[PDB]
């Protein structure tokens, strides 16, 4: 764990990248960035409402399973607080198993037309944002752990999504079809998560500062998804043929690792809240159609796919 | 080299640290950050003086060696010019190089202490301010490429604080001690950072925005500071005395590490524009007192020994 920096680079004469939605949504960063515009968030307290739920009931896949049913109240919201607190930290995962370590890759110069300004300075722009979605996720969490008074969490299971591209990576000897995978992998997420965090954000029955949090994150991450659209034509356009395949091979399994429930984390969950017969709810999760899936919305990624003219060489 | 995260840790019952200082410091963070206050940072179109000098000469070691005082007026400023990126360049890998894997390790959990919700607030604010500083000193650095015209720059040398850590490293076999390493540098850079700002916030004669935005930083800096003498005072409360012994090793030579001025890089510069006995003028450098050393002041390193109580250097 050598540290890393992008400081000594130094620069040779390139022409520019002409892209008029990097350029309105890089001048836009200041108008819109929670980071600058609500960056007090949480720091005021409450009309904290102990009866509202952390998280909804609507989209727990196992809400109406009899032995779901069958445990007592305080088991089930511990389960239910549960999936909320599991919630976050995927989001905080994923900013930085995930996001971050591909924004890194541009910044670092490593695919030809990374090295461009304008690239370079709605990446970096990005990666404040996450700085701060992950400080947001954090304080959510910590709020969280206080007012619902929960003493102690296990460690958890490492982000399925990476679990997932550490198998990948394991079979590519060579560095430059690595790069690709973790790029690939960071576009997905980028341009998918909006998905993930609209399932709370729109929320109206859930905690406020819930729905609120996921809203704020949610309204920087439209823009990520647009950035990262360009920034990928703009780097795919450049690719060698080996590159291009490698990308368009990685996208499918990209989608399904960014969408993919934690099952093993489901079954710790229910553990933890002592469910008789988790291992059940959960076998039978395996087995129903949708199942192993968080996020069904992929509709930010067929855009990309679209604008990269992909719609014919990726399922 | 795998990613990492610390969003999977958990956590168990622990007592609160009650810092109020801490407390203050956390609470004031929106109203006191540039990244809150000054987004738009190097997005307005000023009155622009190309006359207007981009680093002060009055800092420049060799600003009046014979080979150097020869040299034509546009060789001259293309080095003063090279010298505010070099700075720049500087500043931008001691945030990642230095400053910023300390703030992970805090974050990660790693020092007895460090799990403290308190404590774990101050630094991702800190850690969100780095990122901010980061993007501003890129912003300053690829104006100065559009303004001067600069068409090249070459690839710099290392960080030379950060070749000063590596080599420490490099004898460190135990992550235990590597850790504490990684934090007594970043400590450092911290606590003295403001002493590399001033030398352009507080200076007049130099383009504006160079003084403003060292000046931003400079302001964002002073809470850092702060910042990390409580932290390290309660991560060193809870040390072992083979952490502690190690901290207070790693204090000196972090110190010199942090100020040393780095003559393979002035080297670099002076060749690029083509200054005729740049091997001359460093070697004469090198032969002089205080020579090596770029940053002079070190009060704000002495306000965290004091703190810790450990006067004794
Ligand atoms: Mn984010
Ligand atoms: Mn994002
Ligand atoms: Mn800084
Ligand atoms: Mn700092």
Same mark, same amino acid.
Request: with cysteine; proline share 5%; net charge negative.
């Given at each position: 764990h050598l540290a890393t920096t992008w400081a000594a680079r130094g620069w040779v004469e390139e022409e520019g990248i002409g892209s008029a939605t990097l350029g309105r949504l890089v001048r836009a960063w200041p108008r819109r960035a929670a980071v600058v515009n609500k960056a007090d968030i949480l720091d005021e307290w409450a009309d904290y409402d102990t009866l509202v739920p952390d998280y909804p009931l609507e989209i727990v896949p196992f809400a109406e399973h009899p032995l779901f049913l069958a445990a007592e109240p305080h088991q089930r919201q511990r389960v239910l607080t549960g999936m909320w607190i599991g919630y976050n930290e995927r989001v905080i995962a994923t900013e930085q $198993? =995930?996001? +971050?370590?591909?924004?890194?890759? @541009? !910044?670092?110069? @490593?695919?030809?037309? /990374?090295?461009?300004?304008?690239?370079?300075? /709605? @990446? #970096? #722009?990005? =990666?404040?944002?996450?700085?701060?979605? &992950?400080? !947001?996720? !954090?304080?959510?969490?910590?709020? &969280?752990?206080?007012?619902?008074? =929960? /003493?102690?969490?296990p460690p958890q299971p490492e982000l399925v999504t990476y679990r997932r591209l550490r198998r990948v990576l394991a079979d590519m000897p060579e560095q430059w079809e690595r790069d690709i995978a973790v790029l690939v992998w960071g576009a997905v997420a980028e341009t998918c998560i909006n998905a993930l965090l609209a399932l709370l954000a729109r929320d109206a029955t859930i905690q406020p500062m819930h729905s609120l949090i996921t809203t704020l994150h949610l309204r920087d991450e439209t823009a990520h998804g647009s950035i990262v659209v360009e920034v990928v034509r703009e780097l795919y356009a450049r690719m060698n043929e080996q590159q291009?395949?490698? $990308? @368009?091979?990685?996208?499918? =399994?990209?989608? +399904?690792?960014?969408? +993919? #429930?934690?099952?093993?984390?489901?079954?710790?969950e229910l553990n933890a809240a002592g469910i008789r017969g988790a291992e059940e709810i959960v076998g039978d999760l395996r087995s129903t159609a949708g199942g192993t899936r968080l996020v069904r919305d992929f509709s930010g990624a067929r855009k990309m796919v679209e604008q990269l003219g992909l719609d014919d060489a990726v399922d």
């Open positions: $198993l =995930i996001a +971050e370590p591909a924004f890194d890759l @541009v !910044m670092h110069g @490593v695919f030809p037309g /990374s090295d461009d300004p304008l690239i370079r300075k /709605s @990446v #970096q #722009q990005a =990666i404040v944002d996450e700085s701060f979605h &992950t400080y !947001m996720h !954090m304080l959510a969490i910590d709020r &969280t752990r206080e007012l619902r008074k =929960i /003493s102690e969490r291009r395949r490698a $990308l @368009v091979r990685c996208l499918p =399994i990209a989608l +399904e690792a960014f969408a +993919e #429930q934690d099952l093993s984390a489901l079954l710790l």
